[PDB]
């Protein structure tokens, strides 16, 4: 999270940390008692690494009563996701057991209505990813407010050159951006999950290359089919 600051601990109880071999790998949002939504490209290079989800966390290292590390029973990448593209970059992880809900662990309802967020709208995104151009990572959760950028502008040849489909959305990236390690995390607009951070192969903070986010509403039927 470039250009932001440390969040209030446990003020976003849906925030999750997808872990690979006991280290933070990607963000994630709890969308059901036993399911966490994340980005499919997080697990492309994971190989046989141990995939776990850390819930109720603010600091990745310090002890906190609400922190609980869950094993993953089942990983469901979107069947049409591949390393070559950013399309369908969604991942659903089933926890070993239903999460212990509380004031620090609560599922976030995701947007089921397929409307674009009006441009300029400020949306909230959080993660444990890069926080400065030096590429270093923070221990406690960071967050920032980002204005939404319309798809046609985002598709200009200077920006993402027609790569932003109807199932994707952009936010400005001038000094404020989501970075590597924020992938799979939530882009909340109006207190509802609107987009999932993809990023991955993009350097952040360059206004020339806006941040990309997978619109959850475009994949409502699939999410329902997996969670059913």
């Amino acid at each position, epitope marked *: 999270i470039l250009g932001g600051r440390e969040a209030e601990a446990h003020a976003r109880p849906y925030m999750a940390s997808v872990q690979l071999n006991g280290a933070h790998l990607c963000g994630g949002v709890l969308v059901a008692e036993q399911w966490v939504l994340s980005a499919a490209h997080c697990l492309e290079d994971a190989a046989d690494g141990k995939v776990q989800v850390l819930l109720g966390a603010h600091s990745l290292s310090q002890p906190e009563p609400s922190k609980r590390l869950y094993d993953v029973l089942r990983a469901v990448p979107h069947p049409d996701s591949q390393p070559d593209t950013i399309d369908h970059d969604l991942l659903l992880l089933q926890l070993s057991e239903k999460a212990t809900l509380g004031p620090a662990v609560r599922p976030l309802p995701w947007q089921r209505v397929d409307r674009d967020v009006a*441009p300029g709208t400020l949306c909230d995104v959080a993660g444990w990813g890069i926080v400065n151009h030096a590429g270093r990572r923070p221990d406690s959760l960071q967050h920032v407010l980002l204005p939404v950028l*319309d*798809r*046609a*502008t985002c*598709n*200009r*040849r*200077t*920006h*993402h*050159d*027609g790569a*932003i*489909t*109807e199932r994707l959305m952009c936010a400005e990236s001038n000094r404020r951006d989501s970075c590597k390690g924020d992938s799979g995390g939530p882009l909340v607009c109006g207190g509802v999950l609107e987009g999932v951070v993809t990023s991955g192969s993009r350097v952040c903070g360059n206004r*020339k290359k806006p941040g990309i986010y997978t619109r959850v509403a475009s994949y409502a039927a699939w999410i329902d089919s997996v969670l059913a």
Partner: antibody, heavy 115, light 108 residues
Framework: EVQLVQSGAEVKKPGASVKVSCKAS????????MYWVRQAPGQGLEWIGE????????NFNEKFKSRATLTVDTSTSTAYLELSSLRSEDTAVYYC????????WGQGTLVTVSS | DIQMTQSPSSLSASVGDRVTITCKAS??????VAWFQQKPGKAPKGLIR???SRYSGVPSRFSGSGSGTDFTLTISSLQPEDFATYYC?????????FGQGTKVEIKR
């Protein structure tokens, strides 16, 4: 198959206005800017302006800002360029092109301005 | 306004020759440069964007180089259908500007 087809040739008097259309098909019209290029006979290319089809917002070359108008009918996936206060130096072929993705271009529209 | 100074104005070569076309920007435009091909009476056709990225269906013999101010269109093995006019375009800054063009003729 994606294609941008433009309206037919037009002949106008050194004072009238002209409105050229550019109907897109084969892709989501609202996902890409549309920019307009002009080419005088036996001459180079010249950038007129672009339009955001969802918001109607435009960015113009200052040379054309005062007397050009770009509009859009999202229901018919059509983009329009209106040039008023015509002069003989406006006699040229007018192209529409899509900003971003594969570089689709219209076939062109010839606009002749003479007395 | 950023000037795109294309060189040379015309150029004569044979089939199979390697040919170079040049475009110099009056200030940095990063890699926001595109190359177009145009044959008489037809609409311009896209070849390269982002200085070096070919479009789909463009033969591999076309290649683009450059970042900053100096950009180069290269045709490795000139084919008969390649003899035409080529334009460079800058889209880094409003207004977008073209080069005056380069005509590629057959040597005889």
């Amino acid at each position: 198959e994606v294609q941008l087809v433009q309206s037919g040739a037009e002949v106008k008097k050194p004072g009238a206005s002209v409105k050229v259309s550019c109907k897109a098909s084969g892709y989501t019209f609202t996902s890409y800017y549309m920019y307009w290029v002009r080419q005088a006979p036996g001459q180079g290319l010249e950038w007129i302006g672009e339009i955001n089809p969802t918001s109607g917002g435009t960015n113009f070359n200052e040379k054309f800002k005062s007397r050009a108008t770009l509009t859009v009918d999202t229901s018919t996936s059509t983009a329009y360029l209106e040039l008023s206060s015509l002069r003989s130096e406006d006699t040229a072929v007018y192209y529409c092109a899509r900003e971003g993705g594969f570089a689709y271009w219209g076939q062109g529209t010839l606009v002749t301005v003479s007395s | 306004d950023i000037q795109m100074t294309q060189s040379p104005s015309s150029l004569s070569a044979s089939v199979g020759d390697r040919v170079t076309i040049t475009c110099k920007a009056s200030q940095n435009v990063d890699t926001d440069v595109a190359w177009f091909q145009q044959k008489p009476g037809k609409a311009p056709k896209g070849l390269i964007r982002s200085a070096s990225s070919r479009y789909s269906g463009v033969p591999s013999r076309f290649s683009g180089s450059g970042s900053g101010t100096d950009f180069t269109l290269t045709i490795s093995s000139l084919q008969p259908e390649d003899f035409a006019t080529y334009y460079c375009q800058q889209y880094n800054n409003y207004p977008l500007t073209f080069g005056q063009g380069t005509k590629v003729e057959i040597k005889r």
